[PDB]
Design a protein around this nucleic acid. Structure first.
Ligand SMILES: C[n+]1cn([C@@H]2O[C@H](COP(=O)(O)OP(=O)(O)OP(=O)(O)OC[C@H]3O[C@@H](n4cnc5c(=O)[nH]c(N)nc54)[C@H](O)[C@@H]3O)[C@@H](O)[C@H]2O)c2nc(N)[nH]c(=O)c21
Ligand SMILES: Nc1ncnc2c1ncn2[C@@H]1O[C@H](CSCC[C@H](N)C(=O)O)[C@@H](O)[C@H]1O
Ligand SMILES: Nc1ncnc2c1ncn2[C@@H]1O[C@H](CSCC[C@H](N)C(=O)O)[C@@H](O)[C@H]1O
Lengths: 293, 285
RNA sequence: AAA
């Protein structure tokens, strides 16, 4: 790995300052180096999103509606974290697949086995209104093959718009991965929001998280798709294979450097002599729960 | 506006008997009124031919679909059994919620999705209604007309109603094929819209494609401009009705083909109740 | 996402 000095990592997509032509050979590298790296990827991004809402004082008293939550192993850590902080949250996890049994026996966590559609979204809105809803969507459908088709993505993203216009959440975190330019079909629309980059995403994933706080929609064109492809490939090929030699941490690889800056936003009841001691404690706690050495 | 004197309105595109060269260029909820009338006319025709009862209406491009609630109630109250499948990429009007015979689907439709819903709707007879459109470039239209064609060839419906608006010749690209059918003109369409509804009834799996040429695009633009500038701005004075503007005269003759359980003294009385009913549902004072 |  190449060495580099950095004052900060790229937190949002628009900070990526270079592009590189996608090489299809990338699909052969190991996608997830760490065990349960997907749960880790989700835990860090959702801890980041929710801690920002806690910062703005809108998290306390809210109901987090998480659609596409199964198996959701990491959600148990997320829930325990805010419960131990004394934040009053109710959890509603909805997925057609069964959830991880580690989520059982929690009074503030309602498990629902169902694929959501427009009719069902209206019923849970009427049930939860007038309480604050925070939406987390990680839905993904697939029709055969080995990867989702562009039609599957367009249907998923249309559904995520339906979630927003019906649930009317105070804030939302949406799965966002643009269709690749060679599989384009039609322009489509997604909400406004910040495009949070994900440490410990798959090695060459172009997925990010669309974070919005609500106080319209934007068109996505094929030229945007080309831009996403080249920017994320530079990020995955070059940036995430750097060692940050000025970074004071046991692991200096970029993804740990990136994770570090996200964990700095997290609240904690325990006091620490240094910020590093806090982050190191949080990281080992996350890794231990997820069975990562 | 201008005073007129007619015996019947222009019901289909072929009846337009004059052209006119183009030039650059509205009730509340007129778009829902336009769709309601055209679909009530199409489905009533199917009721007369006895192929409506027991069918599934596959409506692609249905949102928001406010007027569909009126159609569903109209035929339901008559004892006609219709199942409704409304498929779109955005959500529908809440007035469609809570109806067990109406299924709301959020999906971007492609060929493979059509095949799967064909399998799951079997053995029901299918009635297709398509109003798909993207937020128009000629290429967008050709894309939608290509999709509407595979809707028919895959779903094998007993009848279909297709959105049909020819690309303008100053935006022509290449010839394309559309199904054979009757080109129904729509009252209360936009003042200078060239859009009509293509209505087809199939038997023996006889589907026939017809070429659309650049010369056709000119003949559409000319005939529709004569209809939009001349025919529709007239006032049929020999028409016994509270409103004699040509659109209501057009609508009057469409609503006359609509069944109703209530008896009436005059046929005028029946159409006046239907129009008042349709306006009162759509909140059109 | 997990394997
Ligand atoms: C008649 N004419 C107009 N222009 C000019 O060219 C353009 C065509 O507009 P137009 O209104 O004629 O287009 P349409 O597709 O019919 O309607 P349109 O309003 O485009 O589409 C309406 C439909 O869109 C759909 N729709 C409505 N809202 C939405 C939405 O939010 N999303 C999506 N996806 N579809 C929507 C729905 O199906 C609705 O009925 C305009 O600039 C005209 O002035 C002409 N130009 C030339 N050279 N020659 C002509 O003869 C001519
Ligand atoms: N319409 C729908 N409603 C709810 N969940 C859906 C859905 N379509 C797809 N999904 C779910 O989307 C998920 C994508 S993977 C989600 C992983 C999950 N966030 C975790 O923490 O492990 C799948 O579990 C799938 O069942
Ligand atoms: N491939 C596709 N799959 C599903 N819906 C589509 C589509 N392409 C376009 N549409 C839908 O086509 C619609 C055109 S407007 C339709 C209005 C509707 N007939 C009503 O009664 O209100 C849009 O809502 C759009 O989302």
């Amino acid at each position: 790995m190449d060495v580099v000095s950095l004052d900060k990592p790229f937190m949002y997509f628009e900070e990526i300052d270079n592009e590189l032509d996608y090489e299809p050979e990338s699909a052969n590298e190991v996608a997830k180096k760490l065990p349960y790296q997907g749960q880790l990827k989700l835990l860090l991004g959702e801890l980041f999103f929710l801690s920002k809402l806690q910062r703005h004082g809108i998290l306390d008293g809210a109901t987090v509606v998480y659609i596409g939550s199964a198996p959701g192993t990491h959600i148990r850590y997320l829930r325990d974290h805010f419960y131990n902080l004394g934040v009053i949250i109710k959890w509603m996890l909805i997925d057609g697949r069964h959830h991880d049994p580690i989520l059982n026996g929690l009074r503030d966590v309602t498990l629902v086995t169902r694929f959501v559609d427009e009719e069902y979204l209206r019923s849970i809105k009427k049930q939860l209104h007038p309480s604050k809803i925070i939406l987390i969507s990680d839905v993904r459908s697939k029709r055969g093959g080995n990867e989702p088709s562009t039609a599957d993505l367009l249907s998923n993203y249309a559904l995520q718009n339906v979630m927003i216009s019906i649930l009317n959440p105070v804030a939302s975190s949406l799965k966002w991965r643009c269709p690749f330019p060679d599989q384009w079909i039609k322009d489509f629309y997604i909400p406004h929001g910040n495009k949070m980059l994900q440490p410990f995403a798959p090695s060459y994933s172009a997925e990010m998280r669309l974070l919005s706080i609500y106080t319209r929609l934007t068109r996505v064109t094929k030229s945007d798709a080309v831009n996403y492809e080249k920017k994320m490939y530079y990020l995955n090929k070059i940036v995430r294979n750097k060692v940050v030699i000025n970074f004071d941490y046991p692991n200096q690889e970029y993804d740990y450097f990136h994770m570090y800056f996200m964990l700095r936003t997290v609240y904690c009841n325990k006091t620490f002599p240094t910020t590093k001691a806090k982050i190191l404690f949080l990281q080992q706690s996350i890794f231990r729960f997820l069975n990562i050495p």
